[PDB]
């Protein structure tokens, strides 16, 4: 989990983000991934930081980055839409 | 506790093992059955595999009622079982109704029984089509079942080797109106049509159904008739 | 001797004199198939024919034909049959036909269709348009059941002759051919071996005499004692435990 938090630190410091956010929630959101895919997450939060005019990346830019890459980019854009659990 | 069928449809929709059971029937033997105007004549040609076998032991022509004769299409060890079933079923009709059962009732009931045996799978379906006859209420009748639970009705009907050849030979040779000895005449004519040359009193074996009732003939009178029946 | 004499009749006669066939007029036959248990000396009998005619022997192990290509197998078949068309008194021998003969089932596979086409190179090219002239075909297999019934019609191969397990003068006389170069004495109870044997081929009597001699090497008996032969019977009749499915009866 925490090597992934370390890579969150690596690709977090290497770009313009906001230093008021967390990453353990994202390491929970990443079960099985490479740090290159973590970099794809960080660049995708960069893409939401392009859409809105953002240079201090919020938590939600990473939230939509992971919900993009792992969920809305797994096969199509729909792995969920059933509750049944919660 | 298996058997939640065994039979699936083909991707064509057909049922393969039933067709292989029909292959097991048609790859067997040729015999003959002819309905005449008065009774129904059934005939086999039972030659032994060796020169040793007693022909007084096993008998292909078998009555179920005193006015109902029957033969089959396949193997004896199945045939004795389903015969025993049909015997007991006819006894059930006679216990209910105290009256000799019409043949079509055995057609519906026994054909439904064999249809049940096609249904499930832990068992094979019986590779037998039946040749049923009985002189019930003035009219004699001749009914041809299948392994697959259905049935038919013929003026004459054969099965097995050269079945289209013997069948067309009945279509050419026989007609609507004959007699009993005429039916035995064209029955031997279609019997030796594809049988071997050695056909004695003990090879052929005939059972008839007069309106007076079933009569399993003996090799005495078979030797009296089939000693050059033309 | 029935196989020697009658197989001698179907093989040796139309090269010694094919004109007695022509005094009759009728064409001589073509070939046959030997069967029975494996290793009973089908190859050894073929080597006896190889000693008898001494002329034109083309003997193929007949499973090294399919390398990984399709018609390469056929092209080797055509080349061998053209060489057989070249030389007049050619003799063919083939063994383990089941890896190259096979059986045609419904086509759902992808590697013995090659054996079907190659098998059809046999179906045509044992007959062809031109018949083979003085080109005999000696066939030997272990299971003659799984071969094609299209092959099993006569004319191509005339007859399927059975080779059995060795009888007691086969065990004995073949054993005494194997008891030749042996530094024995007046000790050799052969029926200790043979009656303690239960059917053993010529190479199994190589096993009996050879490993009995290996027990003669045990404690370095430079002579040959009889009791080592019974030891060889113990070892080999003990070693028959791993072998089953003793027969294949064709057709």
């Amino acid at each position: 989990l925490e090597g992934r938090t370390h890579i969150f630190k690596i690709h977090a410091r290497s770009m313009s983000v906001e230093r008021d956010i967390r990453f353990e929630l994202l390491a929970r959101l990443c079960p099985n991934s490479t740090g290159a895919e973590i970099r794809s997450v960080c660049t995708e939060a960069g893409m939401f930081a392009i859409r809105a005019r953002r240079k201090i990346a919020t938590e939600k830019d990473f939230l939509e980055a992971v919900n993009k890459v792992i969920k809305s980019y797994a096969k199509f854009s729909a792995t969920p839409r059933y509750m049944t659990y919660n | 506790g298996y058997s939640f069928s065994l039979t699936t449809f083909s991707p064509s929709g057909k049922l393969v093992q039933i067709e292989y059971a029909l292959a097991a029937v048609a790859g067997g033997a040729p015999s003959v059955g002819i309905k005449a105007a008065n009774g129904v004549v059934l005939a086999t040609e039972k030659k032994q595999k060796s020169i040793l076998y007693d022909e007084r032991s096993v008998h292909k022509v078998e009555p179920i009622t005193k006015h109902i004769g029957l033969v089959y299409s396949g193997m004896g060890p199945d045939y004795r079982v389903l015969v025993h079933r049909a015997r007991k079923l006819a006894q059930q009709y006679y216990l209910v109704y105290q009256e000799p059962i019409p043949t079509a009732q055995l057609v519906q009931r026994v054909a439904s029984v064999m249809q049940e045996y096609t249904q499930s799978g832990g068992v094979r379906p019986f590779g037998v089509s039946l040749l049923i006859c009985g002189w019930n209420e003035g009219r004699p009748y001749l009914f041809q079942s299948d392994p697959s639970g259905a049935y038919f009705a013929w003026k004459a009907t054969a099965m097995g080797k050269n079945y289209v050849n013997g069948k067309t030979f009945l279509e050419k040779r026989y007609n609507e109106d004959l007699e009993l000895e005429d039916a035995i005449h064209t029955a031997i004519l279609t019997l030796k049509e594809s049988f071997e040359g050695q056909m004695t009193e003990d090879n052929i074996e005939v059972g008839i159904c007069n309106e007076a009732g079933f009569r399993r003939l003996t090799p005495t009178e078979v030797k009296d008739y089939l000693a050059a029946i033309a | 001797s029935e196989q020697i004499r009658e197989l001698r009749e179907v093989i040796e006669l139309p090269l010694t004199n094919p004109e007695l066939f022509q005094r009759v007029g009728i064409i001589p036959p073509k070939g046959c198939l030997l069967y029975g248990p494996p290793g009973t000396g089908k190859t050894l009998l073929a080597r006896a024919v190889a000693s008898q005619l001494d002329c034109n022997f083309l003997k193929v192990v007949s499973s090294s034909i399919v390398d990984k290509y399709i018609g390469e197998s056929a092209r080797l078949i055509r080349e061998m049959f053209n060489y057989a068309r070249d030389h007049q008194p050619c003799i063919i021998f083939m063994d383990e036909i089941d890896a190259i003969g096979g059986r045609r089932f419904s086509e759902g596979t992808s590697a013995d269709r090659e054996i079907q086409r190659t098998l059809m190179e046999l179906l045509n090219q044992m007959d062809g348009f031109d018949t083979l002239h003085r080109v005999k075909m000696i066939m030997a297999t272990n299971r003659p059941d799984t071969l094609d019934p299209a092959l099993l019609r006569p004319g191509r191969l005339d007859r399927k002759i059975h080779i059995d397990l060795p009888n007691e003068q086969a065990r004995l006389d073949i054993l005494k051919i194997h008891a030749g170069p042996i530094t024995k004495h007046g000790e050799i109870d052969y029926e200790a071996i043979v009656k303690l044997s239960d059917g053993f081929n010529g190479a199994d009597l190589r096993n009996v005499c050879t490993e009995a001699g290996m027990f003669a090497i045990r404690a370095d008996h430079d002579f040959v004692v009889q009791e080592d032969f019974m030891k060889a019977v113990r070892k080999v009749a003990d070693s028959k435990k791993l072998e089953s499915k003793l027969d294949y009866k064709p057709v």
Binding site: - | - | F129, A150, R153
Partner: protein, 69 residues
Amino acid sequence: DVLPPEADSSIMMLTSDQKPDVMYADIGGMDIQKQEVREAVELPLTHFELYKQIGIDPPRGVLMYGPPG
């Protein structure tokens, strides 16, 4: 020079004699197929004008089917 043919396909018709001869004056029982092949090969090859006064066709291919033997 120009040579319009080239060597062969594979075997090229055997060219002389290897024709095994037993079909016209000698054959055991194929009168339907001998009769029809005769009708469909030999009578086309000479009587082309019988394909004219009735005006029928040239012949084409054919198939046989029979067990091995």
